[PDB]
Amino acid sequence: DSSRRKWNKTGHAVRAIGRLSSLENVYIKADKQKNGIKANFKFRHNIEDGGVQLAYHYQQNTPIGDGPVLLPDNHYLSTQSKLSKDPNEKRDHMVLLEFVTAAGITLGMVSKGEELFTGVVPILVELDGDVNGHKFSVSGEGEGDATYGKLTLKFICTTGKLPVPWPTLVTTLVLCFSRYPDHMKQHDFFKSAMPEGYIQERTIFFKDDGNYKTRAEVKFEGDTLVNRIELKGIDFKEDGNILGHKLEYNTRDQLTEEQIAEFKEAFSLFDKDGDGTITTKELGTVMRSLGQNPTEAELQDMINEVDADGDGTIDFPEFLTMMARKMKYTDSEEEIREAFRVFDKDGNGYISAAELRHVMTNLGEKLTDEEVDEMIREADIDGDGQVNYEEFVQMMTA
Ligand SMILES: [Ca+2]
Ligand SMILES: [Ca+2]
Ligand SMILES: [Ca+2]
Ligand SMILES: [Ca+2]
Ligand SMILES: [Ca+2]
Ligand SMILES: [Ca+2]
Ligand SMILES: [Ca+2]
Ligand SMILES: [Ca+2]
């Protein structure tokens, strides 16, 4: 009904502000001392029975050769991964489709190495791992098309059963296939190092669990881009999310026309002039009405995090993409409590009629005592005439 609808709209607006206030990309910076780069990012692994397992990545890349390389200005990669199974494959395996694009530098050149990536390039991946003494090997093959930032790879566990979930190896298992836009070609360290290649090293901290340490060599061997990796994992819990295999494999890419309609309702709460784009002025208006008070610089940074075309506004399509990702990957307890606190103004753990009234009428919706109570009632599982945390979580989940 049109009170379930008022939750969705208001809920989606609050989750849009949570996304814009988070750091979900691959952040790249120059490392002049090593003639390379550093990167850091957070990867979200959905836990099968509900919840999210966070993996915090720190990364270093250094050229294998002494040729000149491109040291970038600060930017990010935005990524999109889809995992599948080959229905005719009997071995323990993963099929990976990946798109990666560079952005984060607003609107206002090309290495010799970039010429090696103008068409489709065959890829080979080899990994040797040891997690808590559980050894394994992975072999992969496929191709990369950097013109579109596109990877297709199939991986086999050559040692039998993979002792960790496949999703935990995705980031370890060729950022030289990223699409850099024309205005960012001078910031592409990865292709610039080719064909001699680069060393990629990481430490990956699985929160409340162990860590991976990785070292990889990425270079051309003949016409093939090869990724050779060693992985060491330590201090994992015997029945944690990783060694207990509790992580989801296939995350939902299935996004209904009903869900898109819900996102467009939320969009139009921000896009108050109906021109199909959200400006810093429009984002700030909504945040102030929810009781936050961002500076111009914060608003610019929030938009920059999802601003695919670098024009300084969140276009409708950029808004749909950001919302699709936000529904695909589970929020942490901390992010859900932060959304809850937008409503629970007094912090007593209960969203009251007065509290939800105060939110709704500050967001500019004219709702009288009646439909407020209709909204409370829609979410009120236990009859107390208020919305508690668990009731909030249920309202917010698709
Ligand atoms: Ca992720
Ligand atoms: Ca990090
Ligand atoms: Ca994924
Ligand atoms: Ca290219
Ligand atoms: Ca607008
Ligand atoms: Ca834009
Ligand atoms: Ca309260
Ligand atoms: Ca209740």
Author numbering: 38 to 145, 158 to 222, 226 to 450
Task: Kindly provide excerpts from the paper associated with this entry.
Here we constructed the prototype of a photo-switchable Ca2+ sensor based on GCaMP5G that can be switched with 405/488-nm light and describe its molecular mechanisms at the structural level, including the importance of the interaction of the core barrel structure of the fluorescent protein with the Ca2+ receptor moiety. We engineered a prototype rsGEI based on the conventional Ca2+ indicator GCaMP5G28 by coupling cis/trans photo-isomerization, which underlies the photo-switching, to Ca2+ binding. In the present work we introduce the concept of rsGEIs. These sensors show photo-switching only when bound to the molecule of interest.
The variant rsGCaMP1.1 shows a poor fluorescent quantum yield (QY) of only 1.6%. Hence, we further introduced mutations in the region of the chromophore, resulting in variants with a molecular brightness of ~1/4 that of the well-used RSFP rsEGFP2 and of ~1/7 of GCaMP5G. We further mutated rsGCaMPs to increase brightness. The reason for the almost sixfold increase in brightness of rsGCaMP1.2 and rsGCaMP1.3 compared to rsGCaMP is apparent from their crystal structures, which show a I71H-enhanced water network and a direct effect of V107T in stabilization of the ON-state chromophore. This increase in ON-state stability alters the switching kinetics only slightly. Overall this suggests that rsGCaMPs may be engineered using similar strategies as for RSFPs.
